[PDB]
Amino acid sequence: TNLPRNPSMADYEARIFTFGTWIYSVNKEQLARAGFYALGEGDKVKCFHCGGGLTDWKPSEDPWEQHAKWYPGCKYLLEQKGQEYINNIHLTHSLE
Amino acid sequence: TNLPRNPSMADYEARIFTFGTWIYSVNKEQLARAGFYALGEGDKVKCFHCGGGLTDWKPSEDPWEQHAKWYPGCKYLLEQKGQEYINNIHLTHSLE
Ligand SMILES: CCO[C@@H]1C[C@@H]2CN(C(=O)[C@@H](NC(=O)[C@H](C)NC)C3CCC(F)(F)CC3)[C@H](C(=O)N[C@@H]3CCOc4ccccc43)CN2C1
Ligand SMILES: CCO[C@@H]1C[C@@H]2CN(C(=O)[C@@H](NC(=O)[C@H](C)NC)C3CCC(F)(F)CC3)[C@H](C(=O)N[C@@H]3CCOc4ccccc43)CN2C1
Ligand SMILES: [Zn+2]
Ligand SMILES: [Zn+2]
Ligand SMILES: [Zn+2]
Ligand SMILES: [Zn+2]
C-alpha cells in the first residue's frame, strides 16, 4: 500500500532536527516542510514518505518544486500540494 | 484540492457505458478500470479524477502506464497503483 518508507521522520520536528548546522544555501526550514531530512553526506536529503533522494541544490530552488519534479508519486506531496500542482510541474519538466 | 474533476464518471459502470461499441484497438475494460471515459470524438479519453486527456492509442498499450506516464498526479492512480509504480514509470519515461 502507500505506507511511508521512514515513519520515524513522519513528524516535522524530527526532520528539521536532522539539519543540525546545515551549511548549504537551500532553506532548511522549507526543506523539512516539503518532507525531506538530511543525511550527512553532502547536501543529500530524502522524503520521509516516498524515499526519493535529491542532491546538488542550486541557491534558490524550491524543495516542493523539486520533490514534484523528480518524485510526483509521493502521497505526502499529493496530500500537501494536490493534483494540479504535481501534474503542472510534470507537464513543464516534460517540455525540455 | 484532490476532489475528482468529473465525479459523474466516478463509477466504473458509468465509465464503461461511454464506450458504446468501442472500435479502437485498446481494451475498454482496461481503459475504464484505469479511470478513463470516452468523449465521443476519435479515441480521446479523459480520467474522471485528474481530468487528464489521452489520444492516438497504439494496439497493445497499457492504459494504466499511459495514465502514469503523463499524469502522475492523479489521486485515483496513487490509490490504485501506488507511489512505487508511479515514480518508476516517471523515472523510466524521463530517460527517453
Ligand atoms: C539520471 C536519472 O535519474 C533521475 C534524475 C534525478 C536527479 N537527482 C538529483 O538530485 C539532481 N539534483 C537536482 O535536480 C537538484 C535538486 N536541482 C538542481 C542531480 C543529478 C546529478 C547531477 F549531476 F545532474 C546534479 C543534479 C536525483 C538523484 O540523483 N538522487 C540520488 C540518486 C541515488 O539515490 C539518492 C539517495 C539519496 C540522495 C540522492 C540520491 C534523482 N534523480 C533521478
Ligand atoms: C507537450 C506536453 O503535452 C503532454 C504530452 C501528452 C501526449 N498525449 C497523448 O495523448 C499522446 N498519446 C499517447 O501517448 C498514446 C496514449 N500512446 C501513443 C499523443 C499526442 C498526439 C500524437 F499524435 F502526437 C501522438 C501522441 C496527451 C494529449 O495529447 N492529450 C490531449 C491534450 C489536450 O487535451 C486533451 C483532451 C482530451 C484528449 C486528449 C487531450 C497528453 N499530453 C500532454
Ligand atoms: Zn515524497
Ligand atoms: Zn515530472
Ligand atoms: Zn487520473
Ligand atoms: Zn513522468
Swiss-Prot record, chains A, B:
<feature type="binding site">
    <location>
        <position position="50"/>
    </location>
    <ligand>
        <name>Zn(2+)</name>
    </ligand>
</feature>
<protein>
    <recommendedName>
        <fullName>E3 ubiquitin-protein ligase XIAP</fullName>
    </recommendedName>
</protein>
<feature type="cross-link" description="Glycyl lysine isopeptide (Lys-Gly) (interchain with G-Cter in ubiquitin)">
    <location>
        <position position="69"/>
    </location>
</feature>
<feature type="region of interest" description="Required for interaction with DIABLO">
    <location>
        <begin position="76"/>
        <end position="96"/>
    </location>
</feature>
<feature type="binding site">
    <location>
        <position position="67"/>
    </location>
    <ligand>
        <name>Zn(2+)</name>
    </ligand>
</feature>
<feature type="repeat" description="BIR 3">
    <location>
        <begin position="12"/>
        <end position="77"/>
    </location>
</feature>
<feature type="region of interest" description="Required for interaction with SEPTIN4 isoform ARTS">
    <location>
        <begin position="9"/>
        <end position="24"/>
    </location>
</feature>
<comment type="subunit">
    <text>Monomer, and homodimer. Part of a complex composed of SEPTIN4 isoform ARTS, XIAP and BCL2, within the complex interacts with SEPTIN4 isoform ARTS and BCL2, SEPTIN4 isoform ARTS acts as a scaffold protein and stabilizes the complex. Interacts (via BIR3 domain) with DIABLO/SMAC; the interaction inhibits apoptotic suppressor activity. Interacts with HTRA2/PRSS25; the interaction inhibits apoptotic suppressor activity. Interacts with TAB1/MAP3K7IP1 and AIFM1. Interaction with DIABLO/SMAC hinders binding of TAB1/MAP3K7IP1 and AIFM1. Interacts with TCF25 and COMMD1.</text>
</comment>
<comment type="similarity">
    <text>Belongs to the IAP family.</text>
</comment>
<feature type="binding site">
    <location>
        <position position="47"/>
    </location>
    <ligand>
        <name>Zn(2+)</name>
    </ligand>
</feature>
<feature type="binding site">
    <location>
        <position position="74"/>
    </location>
    <ligand>
        <name>Zn(2+)</name>
    </ligand>
</feature>
<comment type="function">
    <text>Multi-functional protein which regulates not only caspases and apoptosis, but also modulates inflammatory signaling and immunity, copper homeostasis, mitogenic kinase signaling, cell proliferation, as well as cell invasion and metastasis. Acts as a direct caspase inhibitor. Directly bind to the active site pocket of CASP3 and CASP7 and obstructs substrate entry. Inactivates CASP9 by keeping it in a monomeric, inactive state.</text>
</comment>
<feature type="cross-link" description="Glycyl lysine isopeptide (Lys-Gly) (interchain with G-Cter in ubiquitin)">
    <location>
        <position position="75"/>
    </location>
</feature>
